Amino acid sequence: SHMFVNKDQIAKDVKQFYDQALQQAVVDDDANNAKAVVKTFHETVDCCGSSTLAALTTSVLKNNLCPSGSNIISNLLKKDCHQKIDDFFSGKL
């Protein structure tokens, strides 16, 4: 039950999973569960794309895998998916 954890490592592991999903979504039109996973995560947490993978975020945005009304300009003022994950494990609230 009660246990010692490193939240920074957990944030890293989550971002790594996200990034794996993201790179499968952008590239493979056969990988529709990867696209599904990414689009529903994006929609649900309201984020679009990555820090580690910023140049690839352009693709998901064009394949309509980010939230509706999500565009290059509106995104400028929004936290990306890595920022949101980090802030959640930070508990920055």
Interface residues with its own copies (CB under 8 A) are 1-8, 33, 36-37, 39-40, 43-44
Q: What would the DSSP string read from start to end of 34-78?
A: HHHHHHHHHHHHT----STTGGGHHHHHHTT-S-TT--TTGGGGS
CB of 44 to its own copies, least distance (A): 6
Q: Closest CB to its own copies among 19 and 43? A: 43
Nearer to its own copies, 68 or 76 (CB): 68
Neighbouring C-beta atoms of residue 38, cutoff 10 Å? 25
Tell me the closest approach of the beta carbon of residue 30 to its own copies, in angstroms: 15
Residue 49, token pair as written in the block: 């794309």
Between 35 and 80, whose beta carbon lies closer to its own copies? 35
Under 8 Å between Cβ of 21 and 37: yes
Neighbours of 71 (CB within 10 A): 12
The minimum distance between CB 1 and its own copies, in angstroms, equals 5
Which residue, 10 or 54, has its beta carbon nearer to its own copies?
10
